């Protein structure tokens, strides 16, 4: 019945609409563009003086092209026949694959939705979904992508992910509040992302194997699944589906990328609430799939071994979970889950794991909160003042900023004049930074001073190397621009740059939460924590961290960590995981013997 419908529907191309007919039509992605403007134009979406008396033609054109393609995707042959080599099936799929271009499908998946807004009154101003772009209008896209084109290669897979799904999986994160949990946007987007998108990612799970070199989006899809999985309006079947998708995805990646997710887990799992069951399965299956990585000193031959940070996180996780169950209440299913979990964490942790005395300082308590879920606390910076010996570096990076600035205006085309007119594009400032005034130096001074006090807040020991002392001793225009074409920073220093950029993102999130208080609420799609952002959206933190800490070394100052280790009792055979585990077990069994003796 499909090989007849397809053959009948192509002979009459008038059934495809005025945009997919073939002549003059703008396509399907460009047909998803006039309809999303009719829904806002009141002169073309109404009878021109809800749906029963006012038929929305913005909601009527894109529901037509979401049913035509849903039929054109449901007429696709089942793929076992394509595997067996059925000629007519391959021909039908090729006709179906040529009717609709792949780029005309990826763009429609990438189209953003309209989110409800909270008002000054405190009521949710939710736009009409009987009038605007529906989450079910993007669901036929996912069916066509799976049945006709197919997702068979890793690069197209994470391309489509990055461009269409994350922007849609982060629009349900802002809907995870109390008021927005029961919106029809929530009820429809949760349905879409739990019946079409996540099940597709479950079927495309094996294609997530060789994607180490993309680390910022597979450490963000995990977060945009896990933290949305704590939603309250989520149904039983939808919760089961997201659980299945989550362990299916985490069952393919290398252990290195499951670090941000483990950091997220090690604070939420110990609570041992109802939600904790699926994180428990996640951690369990992770620790059986990758156990030599953490237990065997060399680990997997290709994947490697732990970096001692995952090793200390696993120890604190095991101990917190063990104590928490020690103080919990009896429940069959809870222990039937948790006993394999602890038995796997202990079995993957080295039995002789050396408890480093350097417990992680400044362990974050900022973003892993429950209510409001965002508490920015950058460490106080005003309490520490930049030394005047660093004022020379402040001035140097001020000229460096002025030189980025100047290359930008040589690009733009600013012309010499005596007045600052934004209309005529004239500004007197092609003078060097020496001729600038202090206040227009301060549009550079404030960023530099705040950046330096940011690293000073933690006590980062900034030390001038003798090369900078030499710089102090060395003490119709020819410009010159600094060329940082080869500068590269080290691995541990790059990891430190990661967290200081996380602090500069924490400040950004703090400022936009104060201005969100002025907005009266409404979670921005990019206001999610640093670990939830993707590579492209993690751009300003990267540029700021990189240029500041690659210019610091090229000027001479050597920066170190906040302070130096208090002590290391390496000869202590009383500090391995075995010591703590065995005395804890012996204490508990000493108790249990007391109880049994009574």
């Amino acid at each position: 019945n499909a090989n007849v419908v397809v053959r009948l529907l192509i002979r009459r191309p008038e059934c495809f609409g005025p945009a997919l007919r073939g002549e003059g039509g703008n396509g399907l992605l460009a047909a998803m563009e006039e309809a999303i403007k009719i829904a806002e134009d009141p002169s073309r979406d109404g009878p021109s003086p809800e749906e029963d008396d006012t038929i929305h033609m913005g909601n009527a054109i894109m529901t037509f092209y979401s049913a035509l393609i849903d039929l054109l995707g449901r007429c696709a042959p089942e793929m076992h026949l394509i595997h067996a080599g059925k000629g007519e099936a391959i021909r039908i799929r090729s006709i179906l694959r040529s009717l609709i271009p792949l780029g005309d499908l990826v763009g429609v998946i990438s189209i953003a939705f309209q989110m409800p807004t909270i008002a000054k009154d405190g009521n949710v101003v939710e736009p009409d979904m009987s009038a605007g772009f529906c989450p079910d209008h993007k669901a036929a896209m996912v069916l066509f992508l799976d049945r006709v084109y197919g997702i068979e290669v890793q690069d197209f897979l994470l391309h489509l992910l990055e461009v269409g799904f994350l922007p849609d999986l982060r629009a349900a994160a802002s809907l995870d509040t109390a008021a927005l949990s029961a919106t029809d946007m929530a009820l429809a987007l949760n349905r879409y992302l739990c019946t079409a998108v996540l099940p597709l990612l479950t079927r495309c799970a094996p294609l997530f194997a060789g994607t180490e070199h993309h680390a910022s989006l597979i450490d963000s899809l995990l977060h945009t699944v896990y933290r949305l999985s704590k939603g309250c309006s989520l149904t039983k079947a939808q919760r089961d589906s997201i659980e299945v998708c989550l362990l299916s995805i985490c069952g393919q990646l290398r252990p290195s990328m499951m670090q941000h997710l483990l950091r997220r887990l090690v604070f939420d799992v110990p609570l041992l609430n109802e939600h904790a069951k699926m994180p428990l399965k996640l951690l369990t299956n992770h620790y059986e799939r990758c156990w030599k990585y953490y237990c065997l000193p060399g680990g997997w031959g290709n994947f490697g071994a732990a970096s001692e940070e995952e090793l200390h996180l696993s120890r604190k996780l095991f101990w917190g979970i063990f104590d928490a169950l020690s103080q919990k209440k009896y429940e069959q299913e809870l222990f039937k889950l948790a006993l394999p979990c602890l038995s796997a964490v202990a079995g993957a942790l080295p039995p002789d794991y050396m408890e480093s005395n350097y417990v992680s300082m400044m362990e974050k308590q900022s973003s892993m909160d429950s209510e409001g879920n965002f508490n920015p606390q950058p460490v106080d910076t005003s309490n520490i003042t930049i030394p005047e010996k660093l004022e020379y570096f402040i001035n140097k990076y001020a000229e460096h900023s002025h030189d980025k600035w100047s290359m930008d205006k040589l690009a733009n085309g600013w012309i010499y004049g005596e007045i600052y007119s934004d209309s005529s594009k004239v500004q007197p400032l092609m003078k060097p930074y020496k001729l600038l005034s202090e206040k227009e130096k301060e549009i550079y001074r404030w960023p530099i001073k705040e950046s330096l006090k940011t690293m000073l807040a933690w006590g980062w020991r900034i030390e001038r190397t003798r090369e900078g002392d030499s710089m102090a001793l060395y003490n119709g225009y020819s410009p010159r621009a600094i060329d940082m074409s080869n500068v590269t920073l080290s691995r541990d220093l790059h990891a430190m740059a990661e967290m200081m950029a996380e602090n500069y993102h924490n400040i950004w999130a703090k400022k936009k939460k104060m201005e969100l208080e002025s907005k009266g609420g409404g979670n921005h799609p990019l206001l999610v924590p640093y670990d939830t952002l993707t590579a492209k959206e993690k751009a300003k933190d990267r540029e700021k961290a990189q240029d500041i800490l690659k210019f610091l070394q090229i000027n001479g100052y050597a920066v170190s960590r906040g302070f130096k280790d208090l002590e290391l009792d390496t000869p202590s055979i009383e500090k391995r995981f075995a010591y703590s585990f065995l005395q804890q077990l012996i204490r508990y069994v000493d108790e249990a013997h007391q109880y049994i003796l009574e």
Binding site: D483, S485, N486, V487, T488
Partner: protein, 34 residues
């Protein structure tokens, strides 16, 4: 301009190495070996 007699009679040769800005010059050695 170089003299086209001294240039024709000289036996002095040249090559130059540009250490790229960002590569540490403390880890780069330039010269001749046998």
């Amino acid at each position: 301009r170089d003299d086209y007699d001294f240039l024709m009679q000289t036996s002095t040769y040249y090559y130059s190495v540009r250490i790229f800005p960002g590569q540490e010059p403390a880890n780069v050695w330039v010269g001749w070996i046998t």
